[PDB]
Ligand binder design. Structure first.
Ligand SMILES: NS(=O)(=O)c1ccc(C(=O)NCc2cccc(O)c2)cc1
Ligand SMILES: NS(=O)(=O)c1ccc(C(=O)NCc2cccc(O)c2)cc1
Ligand SMILES: NS(=O)(=O)c1ccc(C(=O)NCc2cccc(O)c2)cc1
Ligand SMILES: [Zn+2]
Length: 258
């Protein structure tokens, strides 16, 4: 058996093999907008993706990842709460079975239809594997998705999903520009947290954008046609692959905006 999102392997079970699930800086969290505080110490945020090199898209049995070449500063995140340079390694989403759910973070308890995670690692640590042994190893840029108008820059992702229906399938995915997944504003909230899936490591500076992107109902419907299972196994739709909000504990959420 393995961890997942079902009744018998979902978030309530993870602590038995990953005891950090009950740790001091777990993610996601609810973002209480009234309690978050504007932080004048934050520097301007810099999302520098013009030289991004996407490579491949993979159904890993929990989500799909669009993977990037991270062997140079091609696509980086800097500024904001960050010290130094964080390189983009992959992005993926979490989404619901219904439009009223799917996000990991919540905003005043509001759940969005989905949430995009752009995953970066701190170059001072040399490789992702070493970065995940550090308290400041990772930075994840989180972006909420609501259902409304289509996101044109998402469509290339949607259209390849038929090639990667089942766990372990991959497809070449070159020349994808992740700038087409961003909203107009970079206003954000930030706090120290964790991976939201096993191994739940407490290595992440979370940067959660305030402005959601809209995607169409047809775009999310296609996410919901993916499968958690492998080819030839019983079909289990890849839906509700989100962890609920975790205790904030001894943390303060900071806002980039007044
Ligand atoms: N890694 S984990 O702690 O989340 C974990 C490990 C094993 C199990 C497990 O043995 N579950 C039984 C089971 C039964 C039917 C379907 C399943 O996916 C899992 C659940 C969670
Ligand atoms: N070589 S690469 O830059 O395209 C690249 C390598 C690994 C990853 C990645 O997502 N690594 C984390 C990971 C850990 C265990 C199993 C996985 O499939 C992925 C992404 C991009
Ligand atoms: N949902 S999330 O963005 O917090 C997230 C990002 C990356 C990963 C990830 O890379 N997982 C694979 C991994 C990481 C560290 C050690 C491992 O053995 C595997 C998991 C969750
Ligand atoms: Zn994620």
């Amino acid at each position: 058996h393995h961890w997942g999102y079902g009744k018998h392997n979902g978030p309530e079970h993870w602590h038995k093999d990953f005891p950090i699930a009950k740790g001091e800086r777990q993610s996601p969290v609810d973002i209480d907008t009234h309690t978050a505080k504007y932080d004048p110490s934050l520097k301007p945020l810099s999302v520098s993706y013009d030289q991004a090199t996407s490579l491949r898209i993979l159904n890993n049995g929990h989500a799909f990842n669009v993977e990037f070449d991270d062997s140079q500063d091609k696509a980086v995140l800097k500024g904001g709460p960050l010290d130094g340079t964080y390189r983009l390694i992959q992005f993926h989403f979490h989404w619901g079975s219904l439009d009223g759910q799917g996000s990991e973070h919540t905003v005043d308890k509001k759940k969005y239809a989905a949430e995009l995670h752009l995953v970066h690692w701190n170059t001072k640590y040399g490789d992702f594997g070493k970065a995940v042994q550090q308290p400041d190893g990772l930075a994840v840029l989180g972006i909420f998705l609501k259902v409304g108008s289509a996101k044109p820059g998402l469509q290339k992702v949607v259209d390849v999903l038929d090639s990667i229906k089942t766990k372990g399938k991959s497809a070449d995915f070159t020349n994808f520009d992740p700038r087409g997944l961003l909203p107009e504003s970079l206003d954000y909230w930030t706090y120290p947290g964790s991976l939201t899936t096993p191994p739940l490591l407490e290595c992440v500076t979370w940067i959660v954008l305030k402005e959601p992107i809209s995607v169409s109902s047809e775009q999310v419907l296609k996410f919901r046609k993916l499968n958690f299972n492998g080819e030839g196994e019983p079909e289990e739709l890849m839906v509700d692959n989100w962890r609920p909000a975790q205790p904030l504990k001894n943390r303060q959420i900071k806002a980039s905006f007044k």
